[PDB]
Every structure is written in C-alpha cells, then in structure tokens.
Amino acid sequence: EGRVKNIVYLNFDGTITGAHGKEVISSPLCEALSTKATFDERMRYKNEYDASDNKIKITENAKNFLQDVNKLHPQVKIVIISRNHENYIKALLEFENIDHRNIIIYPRGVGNTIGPGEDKYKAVVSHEEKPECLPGFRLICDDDEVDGEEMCNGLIHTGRSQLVKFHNEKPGQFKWGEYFKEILTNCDIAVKEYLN
C-alpha cells in the first residue's frame, strides 16, 4: 500500500557526518547513546555532542540537505543505511533539529542480533522488494567506495538501477547542493510540488 518511486540511500558516518564510522563506532559517546531509546534520554547528550570535535557532527550542508529533502516527502523518500546504532543516528538528527519521522533507518543490530545496516547490499535488496517500492530515481551517497558499491550492487540485483546517481566522496566533500539539483532535475512530481 502506497507508492515510493524515488529513494535517497545515505550512509551515515562519514557521509552525513564528518567522520568515518571506524573512528566513531567505538567512541564513548556513540557507545553511551546506543542504549538511549527515548528522545528525553538522548537529548541529555546534546551538550557533550556540541562540545565534541567538529568532525563527528552532522555537517552543515548535510543538515540542510536532509531538511530540504524532508520537505519533498512523500515524492522522495530518505533511507539511512548504517553500521552505527539506531539511537546514535536518531540522537544526532535530533541534536540538529532534523525531523526523522519519515526517514527509514537500517542500522546495526542490538547485541548478538544482526541488524539490516550491517549488510548494505542486503539492506537495499530488501528495501527494493517492499511492495510499495517502484522503479524510478535513485541517489546513493557513501564515503566508503566498497560500501557504496554494495548499495549499488543491491539496486542492480533487483533491476532498480536504470536511473542512479552514485556519489562517493571523502567525508566533508559531498556536494549536497548539487545532489538536491539532481533530485529536482530527475523527479518531475518532486519539482512540481516544490514550486509553490
């Protein structure tokens, strides 16, 4: 039930933030936030986040991109695929006042249970196989070229790669403004609703 024709698949660490996941996944702040399952528990960490090295934060341009693309919902959907913890991802979005109500997060699992973001290829294949997903525009951003190809390979495996834009850049080097132009240039109904 529903139609999703245009999907933006985003890695989190090093893509939306300025730090590759290897240098954050085991950090005290990421471990502390991992178990914080409510807004109230997460928000207590905002001060420590704000005092953190700027590399770990959501970058200014990624924040603006997420906020802009959120306004294109439901014509465009955002899917975050990450080996990091769901509650760390939600916390950072909340710290930056980014609404995540409609963003789908495929994160690491809890404990010994494996989560969907631990296998990016399978995460994309599973998402494309949902009955509401239809062919159309695909944007994929990852700072790990291998990971990025894993998500690309998932689109290929499902026959959903006819109109893909794939961006692999070093953290802090993503051209989110250009990617927003790419969405609007390739999603007719998106740009029709955007013009009010």
Which of these segments, 15-23, 59-67, 129-137, 181-189, binds Mg ion (CB under 5 A)?
15-23
Alpha-carbon 118 to chain mean position: 14
14 vs 136 by CB, closer to Mg ion: 14
Minimum distance from CB of 134 to Mg ion (Å)?
27
The residue written with tokens 């802090």 in the block is 172
Residue 34 CA to residue 89 CA, distance in Å, equals 9
- Quote the tokens at residue 72: 């294109």
18 vs 136 by CB, closer to Mg ion: 18
- Which of 5, 14, 63, 120 binds Mg ion (CB under 5 A)? It is 14
Which of these segments, 21-29, 41-49, 122-130, 184-192, binds Mg ion (CB under 5 A)?
21-29
55 vs 73 by CB, closer to Mg ion: 55
The edge-to-edge listing of strands for the beta sheet with 164-168 is 104-106, 77-81, 7-10, 138-142, 164-168
59 vs 75 by CB, closer to Mg ion: 59
CA angle 195, 5, 149 (to 5 degrees): 115
Minimum distance from CB of 41 to Mg ion (Å)?
25
Residue 63 CA to residue 8 CA, distance in Å, equals 14
> Please, which residues have CB within 8 angstroms of residue 49's CB and are 6 or more apart in sequence?
29, 56, 57, 91, 92, 95
Residue 13 as a binder of Mg ion (CB under 5 A): the answer is yes
Residue 143 as a binder of Mg ion (CB under 5 A): the answer is yes
Which of these segments, 16-24, 88-96, 111-119, 159-167, binds Mg ion (CB under 5 A)?
16-24
- Residue 117 contacts residue 88 (beta carbons within 8 Å): no
6 vs 168 by CB, closer to Mg ion: 168
Minimum distance from CB of 144 to Mg ion (Å)?
5
* Interaction mask 153-172, Mg ion, x per CB under 5 A: --------------------
Query: What 8-state DSSP symbol labels residue 71?
Result: T
CA nearest to 13, candidates 84, 69, 66, 70 = 84
Residues that bind Mg ion (CB under 5 A): 11, 13-14, 21, 143
